[PDB]
Design an enzyme around this catalytic site. Structure first.
Site, PDB file in Angstrom:
ATOM      1  CB  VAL A   1      -1.361  -0.419   1.269  1.00  0.00           C
ATOM      2  CG1 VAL A   1      -2.127   1.070   1.124  1.00  0.00           C
ATOM      3  CG2 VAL A   1      -2.112  -1.236   1.182  1.00  0.00           C
TER       4      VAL A   1
ATOM      5  N   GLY B   1      -6.537   1.033   8.396  1.00  0.00           N
ATOM      6  CA  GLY B   1      -7.458  -0.195   8.778  1.00  0.00           C
ATOM      7  C   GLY B   1      -7.262  -1.811   8.334  1.00  0.00           C
TER       8      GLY B   1
ATOM      9  CE1 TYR C   1      -2.410  -6.110  10.497  1.00  0.00           C
ATOM     10  CE2 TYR C   1      -4.663  -6.965   9.881  1.00  0.00           C
ATOM     11  CZ  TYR C   1      -3.538  -6.431   9.892  1.00  0.00           C
ATOM     12  OH  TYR C   1      -3.063  -5.238   8.817  1.00  0.00           O
TER      13      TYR C   1
HETATM   14  N1  LIG Z   1      -7.783  -6.317   2.658  1.00  0.00           N
HETATM   15  C1  LIG Z   1      -7.750  -5.396   3.774  1.00  0.00           C
HETATM   16  O1  LIG Z   1      -8.059  -5.434   4.994  1.00  0.00           O
HETATM   17  C2  LIG Z   1      -5.938  -4.688   3.157  1.00  0.00           C
HETATM   18  C3  LIG Z   1      -4.881  -5.448   2.522  1.00  0.00           C
HETATM   19  C4  LIG Z   1      -3.810  -4.697   2.655  1.00  0.00           C
HETATM   20  C5  LIG Z   1      -3.364  -4.097   3.478  1.00  0.00           C
HETATM   21  N2  LIG Z   1      -4.105  -3.168   4.165  1.00  0.00           N
HETATM   22  C6  LIG Z   1      -4.038  -2.155   4.882  1.00  0.00           C
HETATM   23  O2  LIG Z   1      -2.893  -1.103   4.920  1.00  0.00           O
HETATM   24  C7  LIG Z   1      -1.515  -2.282   5.297  1.00  0.00           C
HETATM   25  C8  LIG Z   1      -0.547  -2.139   4.661  1.00  0.00           C
HETATM   26  O3  LIG Z   1      -0.628  -3.198   4.856  1.00  0.00           O
HETATM   27  P1  LIG Z   1       0.575  -3.981   2.799  1.00  0.00           P
HETATM   28  O4  LIG Z   1       0.560  -4.878   2.481  1.00  0.00           O
HETATM   29  O5  LIG Z   1       1.044  -3.100   2.598  1.00  0.00           O
HETATM   30  O6  LIG Z   1       2.174  -4.221   4.457  1.00  0.00           O
HETATM   31  P2  LIG Z   1       3.159  -4.870   3.679  1.00  0.00           P
HETATM   32  O7  LIG Z   1       2.831  -4.031   2.565  1.00  0.00           O
HETATM   33  O8  LIG Z   1       3.111  -5.920   3.487  1.00  0.00           O
HETATM   34  O9  LIG Z   1       4.228  -4.243   4.610  1.00  0.00           O
HETATM   35  C9  LIG Z   1       3.561  -2.605   5.700  1.00  0.00           C
HETATM   36  C10 LIG Z   1       5.865  -2.557   5.769  1.00  0.00           C
HETATM   37  O10 LIG Z   1       5.498  -1.543   6.927  1.00  0.00           O
HETATM   38  C11 LIG Z   1       6.683  -1.829   7.608  1.00  0.00           C
HETATM   39  N3  LIG Z   1       6.544  -1.841   8.533  1.00  0.00           N
HETATM   40  C12 LIG Z   1       6.914  -2.840   9.882  1.00  0.00           C
HETATM   41  N4  LIG Z   1       7.450  -2.935  10.794  1.00  0.00           N
HETATM   42  C13 LIG Z   1       8.213  -1.960  10.322  1.00  0.00           C
HETATM   43  C14 LIG Z   1       8.984  -1.206  11.549  1.00  0.00           C
HETATM   44  N5  LIG Z   1       8.639  -1.874  12.976  1.00  0.00           N
HETATM   45  N6  LIG Z   1       9.323  -0.428  10.839  1.00  0.00           N
HETATM   46  C15 LIG Z   1       9.704   0.177  10.128  1.00  0.00           C
HETATM   47  N7  LIG Z   1       8.308   0.015   9.323  1.00  0.00           N
HETATM   48  C16 LIG Z   1       7.876  -1.183   8.980  1.00  0.00           C
HETATM   49  C17 LIG Z   1       7.277  -2.293   6.251  1.00  0.00           C
HETATM   50  O11 LIG Z   1       9.161  -3.472   6.641  1.00  0.00           O
HETATM   51  P3  LIG Z   1       9.457  -5.088   5.905  1.00  0.00           P
HETATM   52  O12 LIG Z   1       8.215  -5.196   5.812  1.00  0.00           O
HETATM   53  O13 LIG Z   1      10.517  -5.375   4.996  1.00  0.00           O
HETATM   54  O14 LIG Z   1       9.670  -5.655   7.146  1.00  0.00           O
HETATM   55  C18 LIG Z   1       6.451  -3.495   5.361  1.00  0.00           C
HETATM   56  O15 LIG Z   1       7.558  -2.600   4.174  1.00  0.00           O
HETATM   57  C19 LIG Z   1      -2.444  -3.370   6.227  1.00  0.00           C
HETATM   58  O16 LIG Z   1      -1.866  -3.262   7.346  1.00  0.00           O
HETATM   59  C20 LIG Z   1      -3.347  -2.907   6.206  1.00  0.00           C
HETATM   60  O17 LIG Z   1      -3.972  -2.129   7.587  1.00  0.00           O
HETATM   61  C21 LIG Z   1      -5.468  -3.741   4.269  1.00  0.00           C
END
Ligand SMILES: NC(=O)c1ccc[n+]([C@@H]2O[C@H](COP(=O)([O-])OP(=O)(O)OC[C@H]3O[C@@H](n4cnc5c(N)ncnc54)[C@H](OP(=O)(O)O)[C@@H]3O)[C@@H](O)[C@H]2O)c1
Ligand SMILES: NC(=O)c1ccc[n+]([C@@H]2O[C@H](COP(=O)([O-])OP(=O)(O)OC[C@H]3O[C@@H](n4cnc5c(N)ncnc54)[C@H](OP(=O)(O)O)[C@@H]3O)[C@@H](O)[C@H]2O)c1
EC number: 1.1.1.271
Lengths: 314, 314
Positions: B13, B104, B134
């Site tokens: 995202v 969220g 979560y």
């Molecule tokens: N349909 C749904 O319900 C849905 C689906 C997707 C996303 N979302 C929303 O978008 C959010 C993000 O999703 P996403 O798929 O984008 O996640 P990702 O894309 O898989 O990862 C988000 C990131 O934040 C970073 N991060 C995690 N912990 C950190 C830390 N301690 N310090 C610094 N950076 C950190 C990660 O770092 P490292 O990854 O490299 O470990 C990763 O790059 C979800 O949690 C949710 O709230 C909702």
């Protein structure tokens, strides 16, 4: 001896647990005031756990208040309670502290929960708005405990108290907590020879009250049950245990009983032009009773001892 | 130019929002990788906010995973997401960052929510067990935003995405997320000339999918609405906004469409001896539509572009 850290030991609940454990030759208490250890500071919390020796934690530190506070400072009530619980639970795990008792609050069940409220009412509907921020923080604490239990095989148990009263409460007439407020109002009406004391509402709603020394005894009982017995009476994702009497009393009976306790001779008056809350709010304490703990302090006896502690601490 | 910190910018995202904002001459992006800034470290987070200049935050950093992860590491999913959100929201407020957009997740509505799910379904019943830890962390984030809004007059807004897909997803056959899993399974079945690809269940359950570039566009749209307009379409304690298409499609149609997208010529097979989840799960996106945002990427078009990004990034 077990090394027991009572977080928030000068608090109402914390101090009650400390009074009971200080009597125990099998326990070494480890205590830090807020000035010695700010539980909001992750690094400080971790350093404490990394240097002190802990075997068990009673997590009785919190940011707690009444109706006005919770609606006036919502961010302080959610953030502070999230950080305190996150910091302590994480540091405990990182330092191999296997046993922890977390304190919940009954105001964190849904506003329209089924009565009496079994533990399974948790998360079954929307929260009271006044308490929502604080309740979410408290529910996140219970779920941190359950998640550390399930992921790492910890033993982080949780109790959910009903309304509490007793020593070290805030005896100010404008406290939103009915017990301490009415004790103090009645005290002053009796001092002033006021003709009556008016209480908002009809006095018909039923509520449940537990003396904090009973709370502390139940908390210690729950903490110290064999794990296998605690497991047989809980579920990993429905792990908390309600602590209360399971018995209702009307606001009318409460106020009348306070009046008698204090020796007031004027009239208790209810103003039924003011709204009543829900008709009934109380915990179902079947799990605690099955676990072999039953409260010892009746309302009459508890209010009298509480009032004596107030007289001694004006 | 506004100084915009996209937390988690390399995430699925986060990177989508960065691709859109990097095109904006009115925006200066501030980005830190996990190695440069560990969002779990309160002191590091505060130092960053105290030195960098921020005007707006997109909070797209999280610990996210699929079914196995969420059930295997529950403590990591609740603690890490509580700390990341607590640290960023607190540091933002302490440093006078007035605007924040929190993400969220739709899997944080009750398991048995009414469909389509309006925002008011939040907290109306119990959560799916796999996601509970979560989801509680995510709900606490929304409530931290609302509490800072109400206490301090901040402008911390929140979006609730539906199922997402698109570039930078995890295209591994055993991902529990149906989109990326089936794209990769179909890809490999087409490479192998496998006669059929079997999918568990009947294929009748309806679900909703949104391409991550639509998610990012909606997120930016919501962030940048005038406050008065955002207020007229939200409530302080029911502030989030669902982001999705509001349209259902069967798992059968999804799989058949993936097969076509990839050019598979074997058979899509459903094994109805395996259980189906609930019959229907989708968001009600009336608030977002009233706020003047409608998705642009159809499923067919989104799956084709997504599949092309996978081919380019094997
Ligand atoms: N349909 C749904 O319900 C849905 C689906 C997707 C996303 N979302 C929303 O978008 C959010 C993000 O999703 P996403 O798929 O984008 O996640 P990702 O894309 O898989 O990862 C988000 C990131 O934040 C970073 N991060 C995690 N912990 C950190 C830390 N301690 N310090 C610094 N950076 C950190 C990660 O770092 P490292 O990854 O490299 O470990 C990763 O790059 C979800 O949690 C949710 O709230 C909702
Ligand atoms: N019926 C109910 O639902 C009910 C009622 C009462 C209690 N309880 C349970 O018991 C918990 C404690 O209640 P309580 O009345 O005992 O609270 P208190 O008694 O009013 O205070 C608890 C304490 O923890 C301390 N503390 C707070 N923040 C701290 C920090 N950052 N660092 C170090 N110490 C900190 C406080 O310090 P400083 O106070 O001196 O600020 C205070 O001594 C409640 O939150 C709840 O979970 C439930």
């Amino acid at each position: 001896k077990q090394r027991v850290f009572i977080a928030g030991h000068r608090g109402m609940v914390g101090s009650a647990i400390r009074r009971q454990l200080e009597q125990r030759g099998d326990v070494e208490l480890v205590l830090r005031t807020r000035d010695e250890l700010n539980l909001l500071d992750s690094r400080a919390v971790h350093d404490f756990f990394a240097s002190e020796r802990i075997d068990q934690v009673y997590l009785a530190a919190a940011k707690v208040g009444g109706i006005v506070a919770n609606n006036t400072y919502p961010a302080d009530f959610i953030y502070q309670n999230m950080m305190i619980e996150s910091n302590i639970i994480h540091a405990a795990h990182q330092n191999d502290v296997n046993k922890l008792l977390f304190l919940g609050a009954s105001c964190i069940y849904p506003k329209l929960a089924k009565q009496p409220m079994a533990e399974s009412e948790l998360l079954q509907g929307t929260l009271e708005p006044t308490n929502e921020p604080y309740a979410i923080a408290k529910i996140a604490g219970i779920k941190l405990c359950e998640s550390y239990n399930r992921q790492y095989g910890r033993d982080y148990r949780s109790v959910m108290p009903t309304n509490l009263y007793g020593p070290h409460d805030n005896f100010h007439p404008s406290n939103s907590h009915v017990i301490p407020a009415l004790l103090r109002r009645f005290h002053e009406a009796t001092a002033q020879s006021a003709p009556d004391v008016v209480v908002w509402g009809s006095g018909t709603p039923m509520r449940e009250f537990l003396h904090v020394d009973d709370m502390a005894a139940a908390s210690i009982h729950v903490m110290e049950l064999a794990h296998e017995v605690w497991l047989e009476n809980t579920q990993p994702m429905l792990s908390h245990i309600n602590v209360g009497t399971g018995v209702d009393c009307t606001i009318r009976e409460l106020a009348q009983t306070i009046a008698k306790v204090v020796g007031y001779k004027g009239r208790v008056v209810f103003d039924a032009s003011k709204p009543d809350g829900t008709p009934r709010k109380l915990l179902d304490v079947t799990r605690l009773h099955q676990l072999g703990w039953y409260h010892e302090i009746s309302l009459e006896a508890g209010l009298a001892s509480t009032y004596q502690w107030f007289l001694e601490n004006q």
